[PDB]
Design an enzyme around this catalytic site. Sequence first.
Site, PDB file in Angstrom:
ATOM      1  N   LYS A   9       7.236   4.806  -6.890  1.00 16.88           N
ATOM      2  CA  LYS A   9       7.807   3.486  -6.822  1.00 16.88           C
ATOM      3  C   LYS A   9       6.739   2.585  -7.404  1.00 16.88           C
ATOM      4  O   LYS A   9       5.674   2.388  -6.800  1.00 16.88           O
ATOM      5  CB  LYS A   9       8.103   3.122  -5.368  1.00 16.88           C
ATOM      6  CG  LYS A   9       9.318   2.235  -5.125  1.00 16.88           C
ATOM      7  CD  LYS A   9       9.190   0.839  -5.729  1.00 16.88           C
ATOM      8  CE  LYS A   9       8.167  -0.039  -5.024  1.00 16.88           C
ATOM      9  NZ  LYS A   9       8.037  -1.343  -5.755  1.00 16.88           N
TER      10      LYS A   9
ATOM     11  N   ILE B 106       1.461  -4.283   4.375  1.00 16.23           N
ATOM     12  CA  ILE B 106       2.462  -3.257   4.068  1.00 16.23           C
ATOM     13  C   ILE B 106       1.937  -1.854   4.395  1.00 16.23           C
ATOM     14  O   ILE B 106       2.714  -0.959   4.699  1.00 16.23           O
ATOM     15  CB  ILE B 106       2.974  -3.367   2.595  1.00 16.23           C
ATOM     16  CG1 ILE B 106       3.576  -4.763   2.330  1.00 16.23           C
ATOM     17  CG2 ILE B 106       3.987  -2.264   2.266  1.00 16.23           C
ATOM     18  CD1 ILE B 106       4.788  -5.131   3.225  1.00 16.23           C
TER      19      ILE B 106
ATOM     20  N   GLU C  38      -4.675   3.042   0.566  1.00 22.56           N
ATOM     21  CA  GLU C  38      -5.786   2.320  -0.035  1.00 22.56           C
ATOM     22  C   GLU C  38      -5.405   0.842  -0.038  1.00 22.56           C
ATOM     23  O   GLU C  38      -4.495   0.417  -0.756  1.00 22.56           O
ATOM     24  CB  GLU C  38      -6.102   2.857  -1.439  1.00 22.56           C
ATOM     25  CG  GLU C  38      -7.332   2.223  -2.104  1.00 22.56           C
ATOM     26  CD  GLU C  38      -6.996   0.907  -2.790  1.00 22.56           C
ATOM     27  OE1 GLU C  38      -6.273   0.929  -3.811  1.00 22.56           O
ATOM     28  OE2 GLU C  38      -7.436  -0.155  -2.298  1.00 22.56           O
TER      29      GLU C  38
ATOM     30  N   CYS D   4      -9.219  -4.094  -5.961  1.00 23.93           N
ATOM     31  CA  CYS D   4      -9.280  -3.736  -4.541  1.00 23.93           C
ATOM     32  C   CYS D   4     -10.685  -3.904  -3.976  1.00 23.93           C
ATOM     33  O   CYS D   4     -10.870  -4.490  -2.906  1.00 23.93           O
ATOM     34  CB  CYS D   4      -8.767  -2.302  -4.322  1.00 23.93           C
ATOM     35  SG  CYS D   4      -9.577  -0.966  -5.304  1.00 23.93           S
TER      36      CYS D   4
ATOM     37  N   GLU E 248      -9.239 -11.627   1.523  1.00 22.21           N
ATOM     38  CA  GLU E 248      -9.169 -11.183   0.131  1.00 22.21           C
ATOM     39  C   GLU E 248      -8.426 -12.219  -0.713  1.00 22.21           C
ATOM     40  O   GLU E 248      -7.236 -12.466  -0.510  1.00 22.21           O
ATOM     41  CB  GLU E 248      -8.450  -9.823   0.054  1.00 22.21           C
ATOM     42  CG  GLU E 248      -8.389  -9.192  -1.340  1.00 22.21           C
ATOM     43  CD  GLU E 248      -7.891  -7.737  -1.319  1.00 22.21           C
ATOM     44  OE1 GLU E 248      -6.710  -7.508  -0.968  1.00 22.21           O
ATOM     45  OE2 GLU E 248      -8.679  -6.824  -1.673  1.00 22.21           O
TER      46      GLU E 248
HETATM   47  N1  LIG Z   1      -6.027  -3.206  -2.978  1.00 21.91           N
HETATM   48  C1  LIG Z   1      -5.059  -3.181  -3.891  1.00 21.91           C
HETATM   49  O1  LIG Z   1      -5.028  -2.153  -4.858  1.00 21.91           O
HETATM   50  C2  LIG Z   1      -4.002  -4.256  -3.882  1.00 21.91           C
HETATM   51  C3  LIG Z   1      -2.984  -4.236  -4.833  1.00 21.91           C
HETATM   52  C4  LIG Z   1      -2.000  -5.221  -4.843  1.00 21.91           C
HETATM   53  C5  LIG Z   1      -2.042  -6.226  -3.884  1.00 21.91           C
HETATM   54  N2  LIG Z   1      -3.040  -6.251  -2.941  1.00 21.91           N
HETATM   55  C6  LIG Z   1      -3.097  -7.335  -1.936  1.00 21.91           C
HETATM   56  O2  LIG Z   1      -1.820  -7.749  -1.484  1.00 21.91           O
HETATM   57  C7  LIG Z   1      -1.609  -9.129  -1.733  1.00 21.91           C
HETATM   58  C8  LIG Z   1      -0.166  -9.408  -2.136  1.00 21.91           C
HETATM   59  O3  LIG Z   1       0.230  -8.541  -3.176  1.00 21.91           O
HETATM   60  P1  LIG Z   1       1.648  -7.774  -3.145  1.00 21.91           P
HETATM   61  O4  LIG Z   1       2.570  -8.428  -2.186  1.00 21.91           O
HETATM   62  O5  LIG Z   1       2.075  -7.623  -4.555  1.00 21.91           O
HETATM   63  O6  LIG Z   1       1.195  -6.334  -2.564  1.00 21.91           O
HETATM   64  P2  LIG Z   1       2.114  -5.394  -1.627  1.00 21.91           P
HETATM   65  O7  LIG Z   1       1.235  -4.664  -0.686  1.00 21.91           O
HETATM   66  O8  LIG Z   1       3.188  -6.206  -0.880  1.00 21.91           O
HETATM   67  O9  LIG Z   1       2.887  -4.378  -2.612  1.00 21.91           O
HETATM   68  C9  LIG Z   1       2.296  -3.240  -3.209  1.00 21.91           C
HETATM   69  C10 LIG Z   1       3.368  -2.193  -3.523  1.00 21.91           C
HETATM   70  O10 LIG Z   1       4.097  -1.890  -2.350  1.00 21.91           O
HETATM   71  C11 LIG Z   1       5.462  -2.248  -2.474  1.00 21.91           C
HETATM   72  N3  LIG Z   1       6.019  -2.852  -1.246  1.00 21.91           N
HETATM   73  C12 LIG Z   1       6.112  -4.184  -0.924  1.00 21.91           C
HETATM   74  N4  LIG Z   1       6.703  -4.300   0.286  1.00 21.91           N
HETATM   75  C13 LIG Z   1       6.991  -3.060   0.748  1.00 21.91           C
HETATM   76  C14 LIG Z   1       7.592  -2.600   1.917  1.00 21.91           C
HETATM   77  N5  LIG Z   1       8.018  -3.450   2.850  1.00 21.91           N
HETATM   78  N6  LIG Z   1       7.745  -1.241   2.106  1.00 21.91           N
HETATM   79  C15 LIG Z   1       7.316  -0.342   1.151  1.00 21.91           C
HETATM   80  N7  LIG Z   1       6.731  -0.805  -0.010  1.00 21.91           N
HETATM   81  C16 LIG Z   1       6.568  -2.139  -0.208  1.00 21.91           C
HETATM   82  C17 LIG Z   1       5.528  -3.195  -3.664  1.00 21.91           C
HETATM   83  O11 LIG Z   1       6.793  -3.164  -4.275  1.00 21.91           O
HETATM   84  C18 LIG Z   1       4.400  -2.667  -4.539  1.00 21.91           C
HETATM   85  O12 LIG Z   1       4.837  -1.570  -5.315  1.00 21.91           O
HETATM   86  C19 LIG Z   1      -2.607  -9.525  -2.814  1.00 21.91           C
HETATM   87  O13 LIG Z   1      -3.040 -10.860  -2.683  1.00 21.91           O
HETATM   88  C20 LIG Z   1      -3.749  -8.549  -2.591  1.00 21.91           C
HETATM   89  O14 LIG Z   1      -4.720  -9.105  -1.730  1.00 21.91           O
HETATM   90  C21 LIG Z   1      -4.014  -5.285  -2.938  1.00 21.91           C
HETATM   91 MG   LIG Z   2       3.746  -8.458  -0.328  1.00 28.71          MG
END
Ligand SMILES: NC(=O)c1ccc[n+]([C@@H]2O[C@H](COP(=O)([O-])OP(=O)(O)OC[C@H]3O[C@@H](n4cnc5c(N)ncnc54)[C@H](O)[C@@H]3O)[C@@H](O)[C@H]2O)c1
Ligand SMILES: [Mg+2]
EC number: 1.2.1.3
Lengths: 494, 494, 494, 494
Positions: free
Chosen positions: D186, D243, D262, D296, D393
């Site tokens: 996904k 999440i 991660e 990250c 973060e």
């Molecule tokens: N450490 C990392 O590699 C990383 C990457 C992206 C975002 N982030 C953090 O998260 C914050 C917000 O970013 P975001 O909302 O795009 O990240 P997120 O954690 O919400 O999403 C990451 C992935 O998980 C999926 N996802 C979202 N909600 C989900 C759910 N309820 N169940 C299963 N999968 C789900 C998304 O579609 C995406 O593919 C950023 O400000 C950042 O601090 C961290």
């Molecule tokens: Mg989110």
Amino acid sequence: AVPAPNQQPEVFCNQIFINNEWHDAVSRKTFPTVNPSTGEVICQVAEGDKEDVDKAVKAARAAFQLGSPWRRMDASHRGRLLNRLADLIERDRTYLAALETLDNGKPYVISYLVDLDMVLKCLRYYAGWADKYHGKTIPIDGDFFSYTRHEPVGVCGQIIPWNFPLLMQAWKLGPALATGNVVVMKVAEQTPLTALYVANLIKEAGFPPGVVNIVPGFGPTAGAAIASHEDVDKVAFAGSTEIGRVIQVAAGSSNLKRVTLELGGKSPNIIMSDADMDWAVEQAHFALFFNQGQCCCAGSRTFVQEDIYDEFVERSVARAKSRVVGNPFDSKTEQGPQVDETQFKKILGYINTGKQEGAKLLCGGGIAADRGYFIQPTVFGDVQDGMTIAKEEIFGPVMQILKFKTIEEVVGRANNSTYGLAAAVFTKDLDKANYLSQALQAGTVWVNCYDVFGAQSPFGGYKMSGSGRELGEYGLQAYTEVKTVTVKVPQKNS
Amino acid sequence: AVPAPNQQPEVFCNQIFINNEWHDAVSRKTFPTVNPSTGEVICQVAEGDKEDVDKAVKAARAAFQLGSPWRRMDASHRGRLLNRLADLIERDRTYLAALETLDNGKPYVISYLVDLDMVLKCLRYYAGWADKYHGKTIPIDGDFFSYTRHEPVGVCGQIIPWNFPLLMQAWKLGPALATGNVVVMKVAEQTPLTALYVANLIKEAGFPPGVVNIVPGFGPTAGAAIASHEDVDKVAFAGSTEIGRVIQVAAGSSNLKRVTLELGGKSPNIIMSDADMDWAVEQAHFALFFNQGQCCCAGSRTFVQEDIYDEFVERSVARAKSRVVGNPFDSKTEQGPQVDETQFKKILGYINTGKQEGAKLLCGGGIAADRGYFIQPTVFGDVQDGMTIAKEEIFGPVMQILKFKTIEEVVGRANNSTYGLAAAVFTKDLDKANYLSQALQAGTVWVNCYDVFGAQSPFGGYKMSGSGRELGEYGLQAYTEVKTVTVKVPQKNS
Amino acid sequence: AVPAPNQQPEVFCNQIFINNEWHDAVSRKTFPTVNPSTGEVICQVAEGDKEDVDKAVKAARAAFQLGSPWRRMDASHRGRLLNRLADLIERDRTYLAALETLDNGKPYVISYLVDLDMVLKCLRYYAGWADKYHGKTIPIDGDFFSYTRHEPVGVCGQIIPWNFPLLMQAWKLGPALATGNVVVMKVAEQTPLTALYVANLIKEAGFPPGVVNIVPGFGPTAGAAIASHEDVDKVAFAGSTEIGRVIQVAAGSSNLKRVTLELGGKSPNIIMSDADMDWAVEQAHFALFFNQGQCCCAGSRTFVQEDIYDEFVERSVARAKSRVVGNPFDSKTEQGPQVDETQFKKILGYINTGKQEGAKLLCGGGIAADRGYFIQPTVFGDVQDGMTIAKEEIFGPVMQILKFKTIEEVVGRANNSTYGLAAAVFTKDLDKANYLSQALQAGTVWVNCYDVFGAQSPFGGYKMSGSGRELGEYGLQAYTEVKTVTVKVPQKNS
Amino acid sequence: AVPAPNQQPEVFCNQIFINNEWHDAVSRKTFPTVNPSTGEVICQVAEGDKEDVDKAVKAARAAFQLGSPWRRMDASHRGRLLNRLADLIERDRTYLAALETLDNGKPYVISYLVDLDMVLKCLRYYAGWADKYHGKTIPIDGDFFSYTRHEPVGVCGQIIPWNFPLLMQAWKLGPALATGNVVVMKVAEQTPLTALYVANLIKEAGFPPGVVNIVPGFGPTAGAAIASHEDVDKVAFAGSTEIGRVIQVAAGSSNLKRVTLELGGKSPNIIMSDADMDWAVEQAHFALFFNQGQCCCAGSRTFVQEDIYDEFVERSVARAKSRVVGNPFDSKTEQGPQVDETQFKKILGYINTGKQEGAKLLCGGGIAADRGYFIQPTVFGDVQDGMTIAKEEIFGPVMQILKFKTIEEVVGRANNSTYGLAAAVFTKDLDKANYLSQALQAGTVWVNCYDVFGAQSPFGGYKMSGSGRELGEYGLQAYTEVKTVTVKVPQKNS
Ligand SMILES: NC(=O)c1ccc[n+]([C@@H]2O[C@H](COP(=O)([O-])OP(=O)(O)OC[C@H]3O[C@@H](n4cnc5c(N)ncnc54)[C@H](O)[C@@H]3O)[C@@H](O)[C@H]2O)c1
Ligand SMILES: [Mg+2]
Ligand SMILES: [Mg+2]
Ligand SMILES: [Mg+2]
Ligand SMILES: [Mg+2]
Ligand code: NA
Ligand code: NA
Ligand code: NA
Ligand code: NA
């Protein structure tokens, strides 16, 4: 706290050890073992020769037969038996340390707190390996199930030297027994006594007869008989380079037995200008003079950076002058005698050479007493690479101090040797530490320390300092024979 | 399918390969290599000797210097270069398969579908190992950080035989180059050509000059010069027991270089009465006759349980009688010529020996053709353990069938040998399989199969069949020198 | 030989164990623990809850601080302490075996010969791992030195069940302590006594205060407090699937602590028509009836090939009928009572469902005595896959025998389960054993045996039987946190 | 050099990828993906939901069936297929880099030289692992042969974020495929495009249908479907801590699938006063600002020793003030836009909070362009541990600089965080480097460098930064299910 020694411990074992029994030599010959502190005979010892080795190898071969108690014994139980041996050795620690000192000459405090401690830790470490040295299951192409059995090599010949009699025995027995091998051990003529007493404990521990056999005797006789034996599967030798060559040739000329060697060195100890002075001086002293200078990896080329040379030399001379030489049983003693008259006279001859080749004699240089094989802590300064004392293993209380300017210079000079057992680096700089530890062609590189042995960490030589590694997991490699079993299966799936 | 062969492939490389360049011998001497199918000279080849070896070793040493392109190269990049070499070998697969057949005598279909396939798989396997052979961080006692570096052993002499020219080259180069070593390879005088062509591909792949150097020539000259060389760190040898000894002696007499060996065998193939008959017959045929009988691990003692002996023999004789001997470029050919005249005569000698000592000649036993070195597939029945043809490696299309009654009996007889390279068991029974695979003193035990090699599974000998293992993770052990770094730290915590 | 038990061993420890001291619950509450053979209270035990867990975690965290005794302790010394602990348990073996029997209900002979033996073997196994679980040095691209430290995970919450109270405590403490972790253990309310006595031995062995903490009490209280705690780094749970879910949810809802689980099973035991009948029958009896049926990996689906079904069932029924139920302190007793009244009633309910759903009750079916939680050895024949007793874990002396035709069929049926803890195969055929052991979706497959646990071999569930592995080297993975250290170096060389 | 980009690359792939075929969402709905540099829609993409995930899982489950092409495939051939995929990605390197930049915002030069390079290196690294992740043969007690199979975990859900779209895909696919798993992936709704094109390359490389399935769509729809699925065996999630909780909770509430995570970081970068000033300033800048701060393990707490604070800060401001923000397709651009409007607004919100909470705004702090999500490189001085911008973060070009006095102080302050993804230490001192790398509670500690990733060295979080490790050998642990096979044998021998 160190218990009071018996300064003349009784000798209980002085014969050939085969099938958990004591035997005279077939010839009925004996040889004296001497107390190096006095030059007096301690007792007679059975003089094993070829015929006695033959008896021992046959005993070992029978103990190793498929279906025998030692072959069928659980690997975990081999561990139990090694741990029981350790306990027995700990029970007899005070006795064993005094016996070690009597035969070898090293200070009793050191025998007790260092040698015996290390012996115990080595055996207890390898006890833990007994049931943990796994073979593999292997994702081979095609419709097969392929795996490896890690099996013992078999009858192992183990020829050991005189400088750490008990510890060398443990270094060899630990990994061999952990992996289920059987042993024919040839101990040094200079120091047979403690190893023979341990054979009594091996029997008391419950090891099956023939699992460990010990043949005291001479090198060209008992030693060579093992190295050339047609039914010994594996030989491990510790000692001189010269005899190392003899062993490898003997193996090649006989049954192509597997070979590992731990030979001498002329190990460099490198003091960079940003090193901690007090620490560096004390550790360089330790690195050279430890065990009467009778250490395979002795720091016998002390390289000092020019900016700190004068100071380092001064503090080193003062420390050598304060080093207490005397009766090994006296608690004040730091340095006992050399192992024997042969080594005693070889060392004095090296000192003569040092003088005549133009090295600067700064202290010592002569005999330290009129009885026994005592030699004064000797320090040479302004040593050059071409000097005999800079090239050849002296194996005594003779320190070499050499000056250098640059990091590239010292690397190339330290490595300009056909030896490579150990090396050391004293510096506070991260990059210098990492640069040197990578560039040095040595089996062990110590950083801001020296002679740090750990049962956990392997030890062994580059170049002509030997081959193979002892201690750690690596110590098990040479005691393992690997068998691949590849089985046809109806249909292989991931 | 198999692409139609060029039955007279052109020779492009016939010199000494050093620093990615082609050289005549210093002496300008050349020697002929013969086509064993016709007995005619293919071409002349530079005759390397001691002075040429010295050049190759100096070049290897230069390429191994600290800070050299080959030493600085990322480990993952060595894997890249190995994968590229494999790609180029596959590009030239049809050419190389023909040249292998021309110089060696094996059927072209086999060269193409077997040898070349296994070369590609070996190199691609070891490419993957380049950046994965980790050292250790070690929980040593006291205030220290201890770890090991897995460094290359250095200048590696590799002396290879003639029975699998390309495959032996790959078995040697793969692990050596994966671990960052440099190589001086001496190829067999009978079969120099295919390995010299591969050297061109080594240059094409992008390997730095001096990393691989190849010296064609003879044994007591070029090979002995490698074995005795003071700046060769490690030697790997595959061939006769006789020369194995010489190699180990030369190693011991010179610089104590590290030695691994792969030598002969008289491998037992055991057929229990419950085996699948059709399968066991065909596989026992393959076990012996594969590659003109010229296989280190050939199943040259076929032990058959008495209840099925008569039927097993009848079927084996029919299969041997049906085996097509002829021009190895002809697709119908199962069996080409023996490699040369020396082997031809040697095998004729053993056949007459078998007849003289009273083994039952069942089929074959003679010369198969006028031109070249062709021998009829030969089967002896009622072979006894004490017979010379039951004890000694024949290395030809000569099969021994022996009769046994019990599983306990057959273990003792299979193990009664100074050889121990391989063994096999044919049975349907779980317990029989596990009992025998455990009991057999052999580096590889095949179960309901034979000559199953995987790049993933180690291979090598017990006893006088050699020491060390090639292939798998184990193949990297002998190509690695281990360095312990032990560093004083302010305060060790778990 | 088995020493005569004390049928009423005295209780010395019945409080909360924190910082090597005994504490009442903060609430001062106690709960009774019952002797399942009589139904009578043994003693009161301090009833720990969140407040007590909090004290324990704080003690654990303090013991885990950088520079503390437990952190600075040589890994080899952790091994010494584990060995000392094992020696102490061995000194108190007959006492601990009788207390185990008193509290749990299992036969004293079995407590003594099995559980206590396994406890001793488990701790001595892991003692050996303490200084051997190496990190790596890694040949990363570029001018870097890269290595891993294997560090402890930290504060480990361990929630254990009642079926092997001492053994489960050892399975948990061994790996966790060997790797330098600290523990807060929640023992089962049905069986808190033996584990509390061991805490006395942990203190006696010389483990620093705070290293092991034990909190008796109920699950929704003490257990949930551990699972939800913000300063517990890792939780290991063993028990019901239902609580397993609660644990993983609680960990995700709190601080994302690391989780491993060992849950139920409905393990298939497959008897092929070529099996040894006598052995197969006896082992299928053991597979199901061991420990009053209270074994995670109990063989609770006995698949028997149709051609041997009738005879197998007849012998199984005979064996179940001869099985002696009674006082676990009597040497003739094979089967004790079930652990408590809840289990007792649950099993009787499963028996009712078996009768209702049309399984053929062949023997047993009711209570075995008028006092204590004793249940008759019960066998159902002609069980079908859709029956409740064929799908749900009964955890009692109730055997399900099912009939199958083909090997393909039984694979599908055996794997058609949300469970996957163990499985077994009984057959003489090599290919069938390999086909089946590959095909079965289970963490352990036994061939021609059952319930063979070795401290050396890993144990754990597929699917919903849990995740992660215990025992062997794998048992250390969950107790290790991995740190990569990557250091810039002047110039990287191989 | 870097090949000229196509600044408007064509999109070929915008659907759901199941069984090597392209599918619309069952609902037929689509969602836009935006070019963050312009704010305009690139194209529509299929919006996968629960039903689409269900289809994908069934495809993956079918591909995983015993006897399937993917299951029967030689491990070595999985390696070949990974290597082929890498070759194809390299063929299309210039296009993928441009497409990555178009959908994500990162400078094209970085896409080409960093991301694409790392993708190739990761896939080729894991290709080599395919046939090398051995199980064990185990010297268990008693008459048994015991071994482990390393089998695949099964159907793996992989939920990945938007910061390194192509690199995160390779980090997931590499280890899962190397070990024979099947994948339902996904991808992030913000960056779905490059991953979908790689799916086309997965088909071209020859991977069987159903081995890799990709479902673009939103998180609480498609992502949650995967986490809660009853037939997914393992989930790996990269993204927010929030999440991450949801993932672990869903796993617990569904089928108890295996979970690795991660998550975020607030990684400390520690500059000692003896650090190389020029190097540390530049590396500190890289550590924070790399990939638009969207990393990250970004160095988002820059701790600087007081004696060098002023100069470090001045040099940091000058570097931030001259960092080129602009069109990612211009060669001179160091910094592109943030990934979307949501991120854009949150980052500016954090800049507001930083100002409001008393941190000293030293440069930037606002919008950088009037179209696209461009933010000025922002540096805050005099940051305190209590401030929001010191705790949360930010994930943008916002640098925090904090002041410290002593090494002991900085350790406590660095570790006082629920995060522990990474840390760094800049010093020339050996002891400080070792003291800090041991003391810091982080999955990676860099010394004198930052953001040094190597396929060979594992990466992952302590505490709430996640669990488990990716990359290196360690990255295979989570993709392996361990089976023990324990076989009764007639007589176990060593
Ligand atoms: N450490 C990392 O590699 C990383 C990457 C992206 C975002 N982030 C953090 O998260 C914050 C917000 O970013 P975001 O909302 O795009 O990240 P997120 O954690 O919400 O999403 C990451 C992935 O998980 C999926 N996802 C979202 N909600 C989900 C759910 N309820 N169940 C299963 N999968 C789900 C998304 O579609 C995406 O593919 C950023 O400000 C950042 O601090 C961290
Ligand atoms: Mg989110
Ligand atoms: Mg001598
Ligand atoms: Mg010859
Ligand atoms: Mg319950
Ligand atoms: Na003596
Ligand atoms: Na030829
Ligand atoms: Na109870
Ligand atoms: Na986008």
